[model samples]
Target chain A: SDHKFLTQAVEEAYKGVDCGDGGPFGAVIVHNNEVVASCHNMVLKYTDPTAHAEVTAIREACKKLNKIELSECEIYASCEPCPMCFGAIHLSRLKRLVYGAKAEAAIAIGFDDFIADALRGTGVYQKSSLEIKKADGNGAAIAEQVFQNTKEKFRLY
Target chain B: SDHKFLTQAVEEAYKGVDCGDGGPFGAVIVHNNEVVASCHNMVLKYTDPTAHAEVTAIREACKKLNKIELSECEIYASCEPCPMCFGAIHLSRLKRLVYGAKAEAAIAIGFDDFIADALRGTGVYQKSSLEIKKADGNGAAIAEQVFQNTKEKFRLY
Candidate 1:
């Protein structure tokens, strides 16, 4: 129902400020497919090196609600939450993780190689922090669209 | 102060299974330069796709402490955290991030090419979260030995 919103939100999240700063990424946190908050990468102002759109959105939601936990919320990220954000989903106690692209796509763009290589020695996936798989039914399709639409805007590597 | 621990821990972390899955990597979590916990990659058994060496050490430490966060801890890994672990560091909120090798060294070994590539547009390094810097004072020297000793143990690709 709100796949369009996620796509749109993620699209909007991009600040396009730098080739390396907060280039391409948008995210939304949905409770009932209703966006609670949306964000983009702002590593400079955000004060976190890995401040992706998903991480920022979650942080904003927590601050807005004045709560430290968000086990009931689901995330709609423009792209997969890299291993950094995956760890975040667990610590923040978020319930569901939904992203548009495969984690490998980031590698293709030279964004990062987060697949089997990084996961080589760590058994992070089995411990069950939060499932990396996202709401692909509709959200996935739209994220693909979003990526395709904006892929040209940013440098892949 | 205790850089030798990283050398030993990284050496111990390797069950030496193969190149990709349960490959080489060792990590230790320290508070005040004293090791409270250390870990290596256990990807062979862990079912999750994103598992890696750094991820397991943090998880075990959290479980051992019976807490969800690792805000006060400092981490040391045999190699640097790839794009995946960089993202993980943010979520876990570990205080300091340290590594024995250069991020580029991992890429040389057929490890994930995560540093600049991952930060293509993200500029993840400029801000600083969990201190994702490699080449510790003493730790750096030891990594050289570690690299020379086991560099041939696994396949890079």
Candidate 2:
């Protein structure tokens, strides 16, 4: 209520061709439950596997926050944020957090702490089957791209 | 060229985590194609299976550049450089490129070519090994002491 925002997030997995395992780095992304926009991240750079959940939480949190003040928001990640794997989230700080992810299980770290958690149920935690399907579909696309693109990278080699 | 500078990378790997899914990233620094040192990027984020290779490249490359010259070096990567994972590489201003993965396949979806040629004999290539491993011979007295020191940082929440 104090932060003044509305938020919701959708998480999905991408591997094999989607991450371009045979093509590019492992690829994955998260998005708003309404499927408005999505954020993609490379997977082959030692990222925390649970980063999607963290990003989803922030997205939902920020959506809710936007409903009110629309001020700057800093989302606390649930995994140790790396400069490479977390550029999508780090590049833009969301006003949300949940003990942060560095604690491994559940202890907080870092300086900024915004909203305590990601969802407020009726707040920004609405479900969207469409968003989940969109994310999973993209994941499959990544796999197809990987298989198709594998031979080309060696085109100049 | 960097492997030439460190000269101690391989020795470190030989003495460190002997074997696991994370092996390709380990290498002994080579100067003139000869072993001089052993080292690895132990801190690579591990969200994806291939993250190890990418992080190793980042670590080893950074190590070489920090102490030597990279003005004329042409680097190659096995994976198409994902933007989210290429943050540090871009910050370092890497010039050359030889990606083993395809660019259009990734960039069209919003990834970047931060990693040269994505593994045209460079970047993150695979070297599957089937050899039997040797037991630690770095000296039991010294090994035990080092192991104890590293135990505290890995506690689970």
Candidate 3:
């Protein structure tokens, strides 16, 4: 029940057709067990590649809350965040990170090569307090379906 | 005399000891002719490989200013930003971006590869209004010097 809303966030991410690439990644931030903010990846559409769903959600929450420290919040991402988003998450110092699919899925679908190394027990995944857990079923379905439709040329991150 | 601060930003970037590879990439934010925030690349050290200097600098400014928009600020970077940071700049809506060295310089030194084509006017550079300008001289010196001192083995991005 705790992660059920993350699936809704994934569906919201699918609504983003803006950049036409990189991600349909959707994310939401929950504070005090309530949804504070939600956003889909708006990179190319918004003209900022750091606009991954996770980053956007965090930024929006921080901006709206008028606070920089998000240690009390948890982020639910539609898919495993890339290296870039991972850094932003750590810097924001969120309480937890929940993902729909593994970073390996992104690598297998021709997303980016660095994920393999980063998640291999020796990179970013190794040194963070952000509790990363995988949520299966529909969330995973969205990540896979989005990847399946996205061509390699569209994945220019 | 006009752009010495940019080179200083580049030199400051060299102070970053994180990651041991991509950069000690430094960045600073100037608002109303005054420096507000300065940051070096914090990817590996912070659990986020995408924490480029430009992105971190802007985030730092926004966090410190307690405002989400950075429309009044300008960013100075040691090297051209990769595609990811470009998005953050757009979202932040900064006034300008001044860089010490071209993206080619980063590529030649074994940084990321997409920058060459991006600088050739095919990527993020092609679609943004963030006045990107080059500030050469000592700033360029820093990029070159950092590249020289860092061995290839340490060049993990």
Candidate 4:
């Protein structure tokens, strides 16, 4: 269904020319296996920073889903999705979550660690359904060391 | 000027996105006053996992800067670009860094305990851009608690 289009669109969106200004960033929101919206860093030559920009984009995707009268929809994205984004996603209270990216090792784009490290144990383990996809060249077994070290940072820091 | 727009863009790139997916996970590459590459994550997505996507992104951004093919020509980002990105930037050997965005509290995503913990003494205090951002976010302090108490699980079975 939507997953088919999602995979195709997601691949297409990644073909942006690497702008020297920063680089490139993209976000694709797929709800119910269908891609609702997509955006890269550059919007009409206005390159977005790609951090919280992700939050805003996903928000747009969610809003689009809502606008189209889609109910009980879940999202599938390509990366870590910020804590603040989680604020939104959690607020939305989506049912299931599937990310088509690898879990960041020790740290992420900015300094944020992976969500798993953030919520290792506790109820989220039972509640959240974080799945790392090895769609790209790397498989899933990356970043394990970083994830382990993060636990200690949570403790010591 | 572009601060608010820039900040919002930062929010967009971080969450639910990563280099592994060939999407623009770490799109916001902060260079100087201006962002060097907006979406460094896109390239990282397709590269081999062992390819060190973040670091490669940094190096690629610098290559752009050297090419003088950009408006800003500096390499800053929305989130705290990873150690791989940092190392890549360092390999470029550019001094005087200024950036906003935390190391991204990826504790919630996946395995990231080791690097998250290493941030306290080794990574964060490495005399680079990450420390300043971490300190500003009080990430060092906040993450210490978040890292330890996190519930990351390894599928050793």
Give me the candidate number with maximum DockQ: 1
**Model 4 chain B, poorest ten-residue lDDT window?**
B148-157
* Candidate 1 chain A minimal-lDDT segment of 10 residues: A117-126
What ranking emerges by TM-score with the best candidate at the front?
3, 1, 4, 2
**Which is the better candidate, 2 or 3, if ranked by TM-score?**
3
TM-score of chain A of each: 0.74, 0.24, 0.80, 0.49
Model 2 per-residue lDDT tens digits across residues B27-142: 33233443322343232222222233333454454455443222233333323344333433432233443333233432333322232221222222111111112113332222
What is the Cα-based lDDT of residue B11 in candidate 4?
39
Fnat of candidates, each listed: 0.10, 0.12, 0.04, 0.00
lDDT of 3 by residue, A1-157 (tens): 4456677676766676444633667888898668888888766555454567888887788776766558888888877776456656665768887777676666676644433122223432124445777776765676556655544535354
* Residue-wise C-alpha lDDT for candidate 1, range A1-157, written one tens digit per residue: 5567567655654554333446467777767766777787755443344456766776677776655457778777777666576555554567876677665555454554443222222342223435555546666665555544555565442
Model 1: per-residue Cα lDDT over B56-88, one tens digit each: 776677666655457888877787666556656
Candidate 3 on B95-152: residue-level lDDT in tens? 8888777766667766544332222244321245568777656656766666556545
Q: What digit string (tens of lDDT, one per residue) describes model 2 on residues A32-151?
A: 222222232222222322223333333333454332111244332222333333433432332222121221211121211211111211112111111111112332333233323333
Candidate 2 local lDDT, residue B147: 31
Q: Candidate 2 — which residues are off by over 4 angstroms? A: A1-26, A31-157, B1-27, B31-127, B130-132, B138-141, B150-157
Candidate 3 Cα misplacement greater than 4 A, ranges: A1-8, A11-25, A28-52, A56-157, B18-22, B116-120, B123-126, B152-155
For each candidate, give the TM-score of chain B: 0.76, 0.33, 0.82, 0.49
